[PDB]
Design a protein around this ligand. Structure first.
Ligand SMILES: [Ca+2]
Length: 319
Protein backbone atom coordinates (compact mmCIF):
# COMPACT_ATOMS: atom_id res chain seq x y z
CA UNK A 1 0.00 0.00 0.00
CA UNK A 2 1.36 3.38 -1.06
CA UNK A 3 0.26 5.43 1.89
CA UNK A 4 1.79 3.23 4.62
CA UNK A 5 5.48 3.36 5.54
CA UNK A 6 7.45 0.16 5.90
CA UNK A 7 9.10 1.62 9.16
CA UNK A 8 7.03 3.25 11.87
CA UNK A 9 7.67 5.90 14.53
CA UNK A 10 5.41 7.09 17.36
CA UNK A 11 4.99 9.64 20.10
CA UNK A 12 3.13 8.45 23.27
CA UNK A 13 1.05 10.23 25.89
CA UNK A 14 1.32 9.43 29.55
CA UNK A 15 -1.12 6.96 31.14
CA UNK A 16 -4.47 8.72 30.80
CA UNK A 17 -7.12 6.17 31.76
CA UNK A 18 -7.09 3.90 34.80
CA UNK A 19 -9.50 2.35 37.35
CA UNK A 20 -11.70 4.61 39.47
CA UNK A 21 -11.71 4.47 43.24
CA UNK A 22 -15.32 3.39 43.18
CA UNK A 23 -15.43 0.22 45.18
CA UNK A 24 -15.41 -2.20 42.30
CA UNK A 25 -11.84 -3.28 42.82
CA UNK A 26 -10.81 -3.10 39.14
CA UNK A 27 -7.03 -3.52 38.62
CA UNK A 28 -6.73 -2.72 34.93
CA UNK A 29 -8.53 -0.87 32.12
CA UNK A 30 -7.70 -2.72 28.98
CA UNK A 31 -8.21 -3.63 25.35
CA UNK A 32 -9.94 -0.46 24.04
CA UNK A 33 -12.10 0.07 20.99
CA UNK A 34 -12.37 3.72 20.01
CA UNK A 35 -14.21 5.85 17.47
CA UNK A 36 -14.40 9.58 16.92
CA UNK A 37 -17.68 11.27 15.83
CA UNK A 38 -17.42 15.01 15.18
CA UNK A 39 -14.96 15.70 17.97
CA UNK A 40 -16.40 13.27 20.49
CA UNK A 41 -14.46 10.01 21.25
CA UNK A 42 -16.39 6.95 22.29
CA UNK A 43 -14.45 4.16 24.06
CA UNK A 44 -15.29 0.73 25.24
CA UNK A 45 -12.78 -1.22 27.29
CA UNK A 46 -12.31 -4.34 29.41
CA UNK A 47 -12.38 -4.07 33.22
CA UNK A 48 -9.82 -6.56 34.59
CA UNK A 49 -9.32 -7.91 38.13
CA UNK A 50 -8.60 -11.37 39.44
CA UNK A 51 -12.33 -11.98 40.02
CA UNK A 52 -13.19 -11.42 36.40
CA UNK A 53 -13.65 -9.27 33.36
CA UNK A 54 -16.46 -7.10 32.17
CA UNK A 55 -16.96 -3.98 30.04
CA UNK A 56 -16.96 -0.21 30.46
CA UNK A 57 -17.95 2.78 28.24
CA UNK A 58 -16.58 6.28 28.49
CA UNK A 59 -16.40 9.38 26.31
CA UNK A 60 -14.46 12.60 25.99
CA UNK A 61 -13.64 15.27 23.52
CA UNK A 62 -10.00 16.38 24.03
CA UNK A 63 -7.63 13.62 25.19
CA UNK A 64 -6.90 15.68 28.27
CA UNK A 65 -10.41 15.11 29.38
CA UNK A 66 -10.00 11.25 29.23
CA UNK A 67 -8.66 10.91 32.80
CA UNK A 68 -11.80 12.44 34.29
CA UNK A 69 -14.30 10.84 31.97
CA UNK A 70 -17.14 9.05 33.81
CA UNK A 71 -17.16 5.27 33.58
CA UNK A 72 -20.44 3.67 32.52
CA UNK A 73 -20.30 0.02 33.38
CA UNK A 74 -22.06 -2.18 30.87
CA UNK A 75 -23.11 -4.67 33.51
CA UNK A 76 -25.94 -2.14 34.11
CA UNK A 77 -27.28 -2.90 30.62
CA UNK A 78 -28.97 -6.13 29.63
CA UNK A 79 -25.40 -7.11 28.50
CA UNK A 80 -25.12 -7.70 32.26
CA UNK A 81 -22.83 -9.37 34.68
CA UNK A 82 -20.63 -12.29 33.75
CA UNK A 83 -17.54 -12.75 31.68
CA UNK A 84 -17.21 -10.19 28.91
CA UNK A 85 -13.94 -8.83 27.51
CA UNK A 86 -12.14 -7.12 24.68
CA UNK A 87 -14.81 -5.14 22.82
CA UNK A 88 -15.04 -3.83 19.24
CA UNK A 89 -17.59 -1.17 18.24
CA UNK A 90 -18.93 -0.27 14.79
CA UNK A 91 -22.09 0.90 13.06
CA UNK A 92 -23.64 -1.89 10.98
CA UNK A 93 -25.28 0.14 8.26
CA UNK A 94 -27.67 -2.60 6.96
CA UNK A 95 -29.37 -2.79 10.31
CA UNK A 96 -28.97 0.79 11.46
CA UNK A 97 -27.62 -0.52 14.79
CA UNK A 98 -24.33 -0.26 16.54
CA UNK A 99 -22.67 -3.60 17.24
CA UNK A 100 -20.38 -4.40 20.14
CA UNK A 101 -18.36 -7.57 19.52
CA UNK A 102 -16.62 -9.23 22.46
CA UNK A 103 -15.81 -12.55 24.09
CA UNK A 104 -17.77 -14.40 26.72
CA UNK A 105 -16.25 -17.93 26.33
CA UNK A 106 -17.72 -17.83 22.83
CA UNK A 107 -17.63 -14.99 20.26
CA UNK A 108 -20.52 -12.67 21.21
CA UNK A 109 -22.23 -9.47 20.17
CA UNK A 110 -24.64 -6.91 21.54
CA UNK A 111 -26.57 -4.22 19.67
CA UNK A 112 -27.77 -0.73 20.46
CA UNK A 113 -29.49 1.91 18.32
CA UNK A 114 -27.70 4.74 20.21
CA UNK A 115 -24.01 4.56 21.18
CA UNK A 116 -24.59 7.30 23.77
CA UNK A 117 -26.79 5.02 25.87
CA UNK A 118 -24.54 2.54 27.81
CA UNK A 119 -27.68 1.00 29.34
CA UNK A 120 -29.00 -0.01 25.93
CA UNK A 121 -26.68 -2.86 24.97
CA UNK A 122 -28.53 -6.13 24.54
CA UNK A 123 -27.86 -9.41 26.30
CA UNK A 124 -25.24 -11.30 24.27
CA UNK A 125 -25.95 -13.51 21.29
CA UNK A 126 -23.19 -15.75 19.95
CA UNK A 127 -21.63 -16.08 16.53
CA UNK A 128 -21.04 -19.83 17.05
CA UNK A 129 -24.30 -21.24 18.57
CA UNK A 130 -22.99 -24.79 18.45
CA UNK A 131 -20.02 -23.92 20.70
CA UNK A 132 -16.29 -23.67 20.10
CA UNK A 133 -15.38 -24.75 16.48
CA UNK A 134 -13.58 -28.07 16.28
CA UNK A 135 -10.66 -26.45 14.47
CA UNK A 136 -10.06 -24.17 17.46
CA UNK A 137 -10.51 -27.07 19.99
CA UNK A 138 -7.91 -29.06 17.97
CA UNK A 139 -5.33 -26.23 17.97
CA UNK A 140 -5.87 -24.18 21.20
CA UNK A 141 -3.54 -26.25 23.39
CA UNK A 142 -3.42 -24.61 26.86
CA UNK A 143 -4.69 -21.27 25.38
CA UNK A 144 -7.94 -19.32 25.54
CA UNK A 145 -10.34 -18.22 22.81
CA UNK A 146 -10.06 -14.46 22.72
CA UNK A 147 -10.12 -11.19 20.90
CA UNK A 148 -13.02 -11.16 18.47
CA UNK A 149 -12.91 -8.84 15.47
CA UNK A 150 -15.40 -8.25 12.59
CA UNK A 151 -14.64 -6.58 9.32
CA UNK A 152 -16.97 -6.55 6.24
CA UNK A 153 -16.58 -5.55 2.65
CA UNK A 154 -19.59 -4.89 0.50
CA UNK A 155 -20.26 -8.64 0.03
CA UNK A 156 -19.06 -10.55 3.09
CA UNK A 157 -18.43 -10.16 6.83
CA UNK A 158 -15.46 -11.86 8.46
CA UNK A 159 -14.90 -12.74 12.11
CA UNK A 160 -11.33 -13.07 13.33
CA UNK A 161 -10.24 -14.59 16.69
CA UNK A 162 -7.15 -15.90 18.43
CA UNK A 163 -6.35 -18.84 20.72
CA UNK A 164 -3.33 -17.55 22.64
CA UNK A 165 -1.52 -20.47 20.92
CA UNK A 166 -0.32 -18.99 17.69
CA UNK A 167 -3.37 -19.29 15.48
CA UNK A 168 -5.43 -16.50 13.97
CA UNK A 169 -8.88 -17.83 12.88
CA UNK A 170 -11.26 -16.37 10.29
CA UNK A 171 -14.95 -17.19 9.62
CA UNK A 172 -17.28 -15.46 7.16
CA UNK A 173 -20.90 -14.92 6.23
CA UNK A 174 -22.60 -12.80 3.71
CA UNK A 175 -23.31 -9.16 4.36
CA UNK A 176 -26.99 -9.89 4.19
CA UNK A 177 -26.85 -12.73 6.68
CA UNK A 178 -24.64 -11.00 9.30
CA UNK A 179 -24.52 -11.69 12.24
CA UNK A 180 -25.87 -15.13 11.41
CA UNK A 181 -24.39 -17.97 9.41
CA UNK A 182 -20.72 -17.64 10.27
CA UNK A 183 -18.73 -20.46 8.64
CA UNK A 184 -16.53 -22.83 10.61
CA UNK A 185 -13.22 -20.86 10.73
CA UNK A 186 -10.11 -21.45 8.75
CA UNK A 187 -6.64 -20.73 10.08
CA UNK A 188 -5.90 -17.36 8.55
CA UNK A 189 -2.34 -17.22 9.84
CA UNK A 190 -0.23 -19.33 12.14
CA UNK A 191 3.08 -18.84 14.00
CA UNK A 192 4.59 -19.72 17.28
CA UNK A 193 2.34 -18.47 20.10
CA UNK A 194 4.52 -15.56 21.11
CA UNK A 195 4.82 -14.27 17.62
CA UNK A 196 1.08 -14.28 16.83
CA UNK A 197 -0.50 -14.11 20.19
CA UNK A 198 -3.75 -12.06 20.43
CA UNK A 199 -5.38 -8.68 19.98
CA UNK A 200 -5.83 -8.70 16.21
CA UNK A 201 -7.01 -5.66 14.29
CA UNK A 202 -8.07 -5.85 10.58
CA UNK A 203 -8.65 -2.53 8.85
CA UNK A 204 -9.48 -1.36 5.38
CA UNK A 205 -7.40 1.31 3.66
CA UNK A 206 -8.54 4.05 1.23
CA UNK A 207 -6.56 2.34 -1.58
CA UNK A 208 -8.69 -0.84 -1.16
CA UNK A 209 -6.04 -2.91 0.62
CA UNK A 210 -6.20 -4.25 4.21
CA UNK A 211 -3.93 -3.89 7.30
CA UNK A 212 -3.57 -6.67 9.88
CA UNK A 213 -2.08 -5.97 13.33
CA UNK A 214 -1.37 -8.68 15.88
CA UNK A 215 0.12 -8.46 19.37
CA UNK A 216 3.23 -10.45 20.13
CA UNK A 217 5.45 -11.20 23.20
CA UNK A 218 9.07 -10.22 22.50
CA UNK A 219 12.29 -11.90 23.56
CA UNK A 220 12.42 -9.32 26.37
CA UNK A 221 9.02 -10.39 27.60
CA UNK A 222 7.24 -7.17 26.61
CA UNK A 223 4.25 -6.81 24.34
CA UNK A 224 4.52 -5.33 20.86
CA UNK A 225 2.65 -5.20 17.54
CA UNK A 226 3.39 -6.81 14.19
CA UNK A 227 1.78 -5.76 10.91
CA UNK A 228 0.96 -7.14 7.46
CA UNK A 229 -0.96 -5.98 4.42
CA UNK A 230 -3.18 -7.72 1.88
CA UNK A 231 -5.41 -7.23 -1.11
CA UNK A 232 -8.12 -9.35 0.48
CA UNK A 233 -9.50 -9.87 3.98
CA UNK A 234 -8.81 -13.51 3.23
CA UNK A 235 -5.11 -12.96 2.65
CA UNK A 236 -2.56 -13.79 1.64
CA UNK A 237 -0.78 -11.45 4.05
CA UNK A 238 2.59 -9.76 3.26
CA UNK A 239 4.78 -8.45 6.11
CA UNK A 240 4.79 -4.76 6.62
CA UNK A 241 6.63 -4.09 9.90
CA UNK A 242 6.66 -7.38 11.74
CA UNK A 243 10.05 -7.87 13.31
CA UNK A 244 11.50 -6.63 16.58
CA UNK A 245 14.00 -4.52 14.59
CA UNK A 246 11.24 -3.20 12.37
CA UNK A 247 8.09 -3.32 14.50
CA UNK A 248 4.71 -1.82 14.03
CA UNK A 249 4.79 -0.52 17.63
CA UNK A 250 7.29 -1.51 20.30
CA UNK A 251 9.47 0.08 22.96
CA UNK A 252 12.09 0.77 20.32
CA UNK A 253 9.91 2.98 18.11
CA UNK A 254 7.81 4.83 20.68
CA UNK A 255 8.99 8.14 22.12
CA UNK A 256 7.50 9.37 25.33
CA UNK A 257 6.64 13.03 25.80
CA UNK A 258 7.09 12.67 29.53
CA UNK A 259 8.11 9.69 31.66
CA UNK A 260 8.65 6.31 30.02
CA UNK A 261 5.74 4.70 31.82
CA UNK A 262 5.54 1.41 29.93
CA UNK A 263 7.79 -0.88 27.85
CA UNK A 264 4.87 -3.06 26.63
CA UNK A 265 2.72 -1.63 23.80
CA UNK A 266 -0.28 -3.86 24.11
CA UNK A 267 -3.92 -4.44 23.03
CA UNK A 268 -5.32 -1.33 21.39
CA UNK A 269 -7.12 0.15 18.39
CA UNK A 270 -6.67 2.87 15.77
CA UNK A 271 -8.96 5.80 16.26
CA UNK A 272 -11.59 5.50 13.56
CA UNK A 273 -13.12 8.71 12.41
CA UNK A 274 -15.21 9.48 9.41
CA UNK A 275 -17.30 6.42 8.74
CA UNK A 276 -17.38 4.28 11.76
CA UNK A 277 -19.15 1.44 9.99
CA UNK A 278 -18.54 -2.23 9.30
CA UNK A 279 -15.89 -1.65 6.70
CA UNK A 280 -13.40 -0.65 9.51
CA UNK A 281 -11.82 2.02 7.36
CA UNK A 282 -8.81 4.04 8.73
CA UNK A 283 -7.03 7.18 7.56
CA UNK A 284 -3.42 6.20 6.99
CA UNK A 285 -2.41 9.91 6.99
CA UNK A 286 -3.48 10.49 10.58
CA UNK A 287 -3.10 7.27 12.60
CA UNK A 288 -3.50 7.46 16.37
CA UNK A 289 -3.69 4.21 18.35
CA UNK A 290 -5.20 3.94 21.87
CA UNK A 291 -3.21 1.25 23.69
CA UNK A 292 -2.63 -0.36 27.03
CA UNK A 293 0.55 -0.23 28.94
CA UNK A 294 1.88 -0.82 32.43
CA UNK A 295 4.76 -0.07 34.75
CA UNK A 296 7.43 -2.47 33.49
CA UNK A 297 8.64 -3.13 37.03
CA UNK A 298 5.22 -4.59 38.06
CA UNK A 299 4.59 -8.25 38.36
CA UNK A 300 2.22 -10.74 39.85
CA UNK A 301 -0.96 -12.41 38.61
CA UNK A 302 -1.78 -11.34 35.08
CA UNK A 303 -5.37 -10.41 35.82
CA UNK A 304 -4.36 -7.94 38.55
CA UNK A 305 -1.64 -6.12 36.55
CA UNK A 306 -1.96 -2.34 36.53
CA UNK A 307 -2.89 -1.76 32.91
CA UNK A 308 -3.59 1.84 31.88
CA UNK A 309 -4.54 3.41 28.56
CA UNK A 310 -2.70 5.99 26.55
CA UNK A 311 -2.29 6.98 22.93
CA UNK A 312 0.46 6.73 20.36
CA UNK A 313 0.46 9.15 17.43
CA UNK A 314 2.09 8.18 14.19
CA UNK A 315 5.14 10.44 13.56
CA UNK A 316 6.09 9.44 10.06
CA UNK A 317 2.91 9.36 7.92
CA UNK A 318 3.57 8.44 4.22
CA UNK A 319 0.77 10.79 2.79
CA1 LIG B 1 -9.48 -5.42 20.57
Amino acid sequence: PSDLPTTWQWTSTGPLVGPKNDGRGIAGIKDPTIILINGTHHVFASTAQSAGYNLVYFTFADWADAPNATFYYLDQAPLGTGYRAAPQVFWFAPHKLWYLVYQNGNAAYSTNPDINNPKGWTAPKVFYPDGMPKIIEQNIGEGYWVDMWVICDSASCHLFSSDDNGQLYRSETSLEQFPNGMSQPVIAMQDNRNDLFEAACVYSLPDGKYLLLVEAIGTDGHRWFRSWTADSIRGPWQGLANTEQNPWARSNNVQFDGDVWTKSISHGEIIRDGTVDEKLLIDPCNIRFMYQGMDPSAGGEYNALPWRLGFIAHNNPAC
